[PDB]
């Protein structure tokens, strides 16, 4: 019949360990996710969604009593939590990534990164300018044909599916590991005119393998969360690289790149800018961009060997 | 057109003040949502009593907030292993009214929470505390909507389950029962076994001495439904003692005490006839207690009748 | 895993048989029921009469849009509603959109009751087409919005129960050719009105509490919402009473959209439904909102009430 | 508050005109809602999904009393409906297109094409071998971040979103028209080595425009329903063309190409094999393949101008 020992995201977080603030934080975040999932599922019947999602995530995070500094893709400055509701965590989030293409029922998502406040001073925007290497937890919610929450922590990557009947995230995939080498490459080839020669050579090798091996398949949803999730589940490589026109790439470091890089690394994958690990970049602005190449370690290493040969 | 500042049961509990009570009530809400879903699909999918009991026990142990668990479905108290233990003692009725589930009658989960008072290892004895010691108590009613009624020192608040997002939303703040109602509730089928005070009291409701209008009668046969109606519309609910059942039928720990606590926190009353239900010092985890509860003026009217048939 | 041959209310109605208008009608009605169920389940979060009005509007709009109806009688409307010629069909529908709604705030089960007739007359549709005895019913039943949502449907072939599956928004067949127990052990009425009871009611109730034959006294149940009390009577057996007295010589319940549909379900389940003088289904109405006394349920219990009733005048 | 005049798929079909088409589309919607639910819970529950979806669609269609011949992607031969349940329509369907990549939560879908039986003999597989031009109705259900049913008929294309709260398809987009020219191209560029020169040249013009205009963006989900739906909603072009290795393309004519081509044409778009309209191909086998280039009329015409210059 029905399962009596329901393995929820809450139970999982509680089992991992201090004070209990991380559980409070992730529980509040799950409330926001469920509400966003519901609004997305009814979108047609009901920039509106970006604003609503941002408000939901901000309100739920402030009310958790677990956070002090909140950085969102939708706000120019960091939001400082009032002392009454404050906690010890710094949260960087992307409330509804992929929303520009919502009308085609493409998967959209909420991306998040959690840091423990490291400084000995009052909370400020500066507390969010930490390299992704300092992440305590990071992940995303994918609003697709099912709602999934992927959570990475020091112990690894775990996937939780939203059960619509009981409104709970259930553990479905334990200690997820990416394949060593995949057979799919993912990037917007529409920008080929602006590509760096290393990118052009790398793609050419995927379509025309020198070694008689089978050409890779191509997939590009245009929604970061969907493209990263497919990379995690099936293996392969995802690229949003730098070029002469965009020397720092297009994607945002704090709430797009770093969380995805952390999930990748905790799954046994890689995430590079080409020059260094995405997680090693020390940000100087909360909205700064970063180039990103991530996925299966053998595929990223192959890209890096091509990248090196087009370097001084 | 959607609310951005969602007022959940979790937010409410957190605002009232380690954080163990919040963890406890959050785990309980998970069990409630799962029970609600199973009840809503019962025919498409007795066994529900067992499932509900297992769900509530597993969720409570996993909260890290409990040390002693007493259920209507278990002979002895369950002691939580040291790894998962916390400071609270929980008495619960996982699926009250389940014998009549097939008629789509409202069923419910009743619960009572105590902070461990003793200075020793947790035991069954920690559950033998008068209802007066309750930290929190309430019920989930699985009816036309799913409602969670929560009573604490600050009062009674009602939360409705939002099916779209699986969260309990605050719908009724600091709930107060009417001073006097116009409905009486008991199984009149047992009239042959009634104590004369009960017979006289019911006769006064049907044939008022003062020319006032006779009260209406309602009896669902599901304690949570009958108590909830009493709270919302006022009046009186009776499951009293008689010659055959000198201690009543309902169970003190996980039926009477939680309902009595909700009643008192709503400005109502809950008596055995001799004393407040909350004042009975239990000696067995499955002991019975007579119960008369509701609108204070209605219960006082019953007590005046009860006194004249005493001494 | 999952069931591949889903037995829906729609499939069931289609299998029973002409033109296909009855299926269209019951499909439209199910849409209204699902929307009412949802609104009831969220009542406190949303609402903050409202639900009576909404339910009535939903049922009216869905029925008109089915292309299966010509005359609609509702508890909520003074006169019958005549369907515009464009959307006209051959059925007459009497309904109670949200019976028990006065007590909605206590999460008591509420319900939608319905009765369907074929227009018998050779003239233009009018209110008069709804003034037909229950014996003429083609289909009748109710939706119960309780701990689960159930649709009970009676037709010439019998009574079938369908439960709403919330995951797929469809009514699934759960109970085939439902029959009430010959004799039950529960009686149901508002005993608060004892002062106004006719002696036959008083004596009957006394026999239930104080059995002459040493048998066990019956249990009492009274929800105060007709659909809940009738449904419990169907499922567990027993008797339900809303009888006539000196003050209300015609009873309290409404014949067209409360009594007749419930009486039809009862008779099709092997039970009984009487006014005391005749079968509820045999009353020829003269007004769309006329009242009728009703005693229904297990055939042995209703017969036992009638034996007491016969001894009086 | 709540909308009282609910505009459902059923109401819409009934308004367009025995009533067999309504019965057929209503049964199909039941199957779609059940597939949507199973997809939404896929991981919590468990090729299995392909089989389940196929069984659901077959059973619901047979039970509608509206069909006589059923062709599915999952069955080698056509299914002939038993005399008792027989109706006048022929249905070609793809029960769970894109299912090979289900685990990445990519949008999947059900594609369908409906024909009226034209022959005056006993029903057979041959009744399904009709050109897409003969379609009475066609469309798809997209199981994505929301569930949508896109329905094309002689009158045009209409989109219905599944309302999870009431389990009904609600009209959200009336008489849908594709943009004359889009700014997105969609194909698996991983197969570039096998491309015919006209495809290679066409793609090169999209990345390197001769006229100083902005290069097009690229999108390729790898699920036909998702890629076609994005093309309808935002405009542009979708290509699954013929090459030396696959002279007839990869996609199946009866239950993938023809339904998508009919939706495209009814939206003011185009759908070509390169030599003719997909809808004009006279099938000879139920599982035959067809090359397909579809979308915004100006974009498809621009591909055809390149195609014309080659052999
Ligand atoms: Cl591997
Ligand atoms: Cl029997
Ligand atoms: Zn973003
Ligand atoms: Zn109980
Ligand atoms: Zn009524
Ligand atoms: Zn007499
Ligand atoms: Zn396919
Ligand atoms: Zn050429």
Residue numbers in the entry:
A (entry chain B): 6 to 22, 27 to 55, 72 to 337
B (entry chain C): 6 to 22, 28 to 55, 72 to 337
C (entry chain D): 6 to 22, 27 to 57, 72 to 336
D (entry chain A): 6 to 22, 28 to 56, 72 to 336
The authors write:
Inhibition of the liver isoform of FBPase (hlFBPase; the other isoform being the muscle isoform) is therefore an attractive avenue for disease treatment. The subunits are labelled C1–C4 and form two functional dimers: C1/C2 and C3/C4. In the enzymatically active R state of the hlFBPase tetramer, the dimers are little, if at all, rotated and the protomers are therefore arranged as an almost planar rectangle. In contrast, binding of the allosteric regulator AMP facilitates rotation of the dimers by ∼15°, leading to detachment of the catalytic loop.
Here, we have determined the structure of hlFBPase in a novel primitive tetragonal crystal form in the active R state. The combination of a twofold rNCS at a special position with tNCS of vulgar fractions of a unit-cell length leads to pseudo-body-centred tetragonal symmetry, but the true space group is P41212. By contrast, the translation vectors in the ab plane vary by as much as 4.6% (5.6 Å) from zero or 1/2, indicating that the reason for the breakdown of symmetry, which prohibits an I-centred lattice, is owing to lateral translation of the hlFBPase dimers in the ab plane. Although excess F-2,6-P2 was present during crystallization of hlFBPase to facilitate formation of the R state, the electron density does not support the presence of this competitive inhibitor in the active site. The structure of hlFBPase contains a single metal ion at position M1, which based on the crystallization conditions could in principle be Mg2+, Mn2+ or Zn2+. A search in the CSD for zinc- and mangan­ese-containing compounds revealed only 103 small molecules with an Mn atom in trigonal bipyramidal geometry (0.57%), while a Zn atom in this geometry was present in 498 small-molecule crystal structures (1.87%), further hinting towards a Zn2+ at the M1 site. Residues 55–70 of the catalytic loop are disordered in the hlFBPase structure, possibly explaining the absence of the other cations. The hlFBPase structure exhibits a number of interesting properties, including a metal ion in a comparatively rare trigonal bipyramidal coordination bound via a water molecule to a sulfate ion that mimics the leaving inorganic phosphate after hydrolysis of the substrate.
